[PDB]
TrEMBL record, chain A:
Binding site for Fe(3+): 101, 163, 197, 200
Keywords: Metal-binding
Name the UniProt record assigns to this protein: Ribonucleoside-diphosphate reductase small chain, putative
Source taxon at top rank: Eukaryota
One example of a Gene Ontology biological process annotation: deoxyribonucleotide biosynthetic process
Entry's Gene Ontology molecular function annotations: metal ion binding; oxidoreductase activity
First-to-last residue of the parent protein present: 25 to 310 of 349
Family label: Belongs to the ribonucleoside diphosphate reductase small chain family.
Disulfide cysteine pairs (residue numbers): 236-241
Automatic annotation (TrEMBL), chain B:
Residues of the full protein shown: 18 to 312 of 349
Transmembrane segments annotated in the record for this chain: none
Keywords carried by this UniProt record: Metal-binding
GO BP: any one term: deoxyribonucleotide biosynthetic process
Disulfide cross-links: 241-246
Residues in the signal sequence: none
GO molecular function: metal ion binding; oxidoreductase activity
Domain of life: Eukaryota
Protein name: Ribonucleoside-diphosphate reductase small chain, putative
């Protein structure tokens, strides 16, 4: 797929010297939406969630999901796509996206600081996380699918999965706590973060649709099926599922994976419906 | 380059250039002043959506030909005349956050200039000619030689950060000021209002680079700091009221150089150097 280096969105825009007129109104609308959705960690009121955080099986599940969010990913890819996509509308969106991932990361840190007041507990939790069978699986999948050896199209599809598939079970877990009306700053920041992550997903699906040379159906399905297994491996397995049904969560993960496929222009492969009408 | 080769050989093990190995989370905050800058930036967030140019277009059409030509060239210079590189080079989390935010904000400045240019220069052909015309002026070529000398993969980080401070602190200082000259005439509100937002952002960017420089154990010789800064002034003087003469327009070229020298001295002393120009700010409207 790499021999197609004649892609227009991967080609330098010599003919253009300023932003207007807008050449890609649809990718520009996504930038305008991200910009208008901007929020800071300051909007999270935490005080009334530490009294609220203070059962013991829930406490344990939360500490581990926060630690996962904060520490699960190894060694930047919004920055890669910022460098290699050439259209200004797309450069703007990826650069805004790096600053929003940073707000996400800060918000998880802040949550962590509030929930685990003890620096010793917290360091112990970060070390024991950094060895989980789900953290290793993720790194294998990234190793495989986010190479400089890979095509831009495989990388864009893999990006779509990091945004739309990975973490979707932990987002769901926290939505289950919201359905229960518990832990209000966690569930509030979770719904903002999850909202951003959905925009980031549709945006890569949009970039992928600007490509004249798309992947074979089979290759898209491989990438996605594998991201599913990585995701299966955490929220009801490496960390046991405390009032949630493990099997129904597998179906929800598979449901978001099919939805991404549709979005990437491929057939569903799981045919799972959404088990949770609360999502 | 003797003073540069000794500087790099020393930055081997600068704190802020060394991986945070024993850090795993943002809290507790290890650099509270770097953090404070990030929070101020983020609290300052604004977008080009807040700029409206309807009043401006009425004003612009009343302007004489000299003033229109002056405005078009200043805009075209702003539009087309490395936070991403500092993002990667500084290793501390609070600074990385600031730099990444800075990219998004500078993108907003760029969009704002694109918007101004689309409204002020509705003709696509004259725009095209404007941009082709400025790519050639000495002032752009002066800009590029200074930048090729002081910002390269060969430099010492300390050099690059003082250059970076001049880019924000000194370059465009004259065009910012010239736009405030128009505000003083109660004209072109979109232009002057987005000008104060963007000018205020560059102030914050300048001070942050001064802070970062202060976090270095190994400082540059004052003589190197002064050369960077004198050369940047010369770059800035070569455009505003030289490549684009302002006197015909009611402005004063001689006070313009004096104002740029004032800004430069304020940078040096922010970088912990003695002033070298001793120029005072000639313009009562430029901090008021
Ligand atoms: Fe994201
Ligand atoms: Fe700046």
């Amino acid at each position: 797929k790499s021999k197609e280096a004649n892609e227009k969105i991967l080609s330098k825009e010599t003919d253009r010297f300023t932003l207007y007129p807008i050449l890609y109104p649809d990718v520009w609308d996504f930038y305008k939406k991200a910009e208008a959705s901007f929020w800071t960690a300051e909007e999270i009121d935490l005080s009334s969630d530490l009294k609220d955080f203070e059962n013991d099986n829930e406490k344990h599940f939360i500490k581990h999901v926060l630690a996962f969010f904060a520490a699960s990913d190894g060694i930047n890819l919004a920055s890669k796509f910022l460098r290699q996509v050439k259209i200004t509308e797309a450069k703007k969106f990826y650069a805004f996206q790096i600053a929003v991932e940073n707000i996400h990361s800060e918000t998880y840190s802040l949550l962590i600081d509030n929930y685990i007041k003890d620096e010793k507990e917290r360091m112990n939790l970060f070390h024991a996380i950094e060895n989980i069978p789900a953290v290793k699986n993720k790194a294998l999948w990234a190793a495989k699918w986010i190479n400089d050896t890979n095509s831009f199209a495989e990388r864009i599809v893999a990006n779509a999965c990091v945004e739309g598939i990975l973490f979707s079970g932990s987002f769901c877990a926290i939505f289950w706590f919201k359905k229960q009306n518990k832990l209000h700053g966690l569930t509030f920041s979770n719904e903002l973060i999850s909202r951003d992550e959905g925009l980031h997903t549709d945006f890569n699906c949009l970039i992928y649709s600007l490509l004249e040379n798309k992947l074979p159906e089979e290759v898209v399905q491989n990438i996605v099926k594998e991201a599913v297994e990585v995701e299966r491996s955490f929220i009801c397995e490496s960390l046991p599922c405390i009032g949630m049904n493990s099997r129904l969560m597998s179906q929800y993960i598979e449901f978001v994976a099919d939805r991404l496929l549709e979005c990437l222009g491929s057939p569903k492969i799981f045919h799972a419906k959404n088990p949770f009408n609360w999502m």
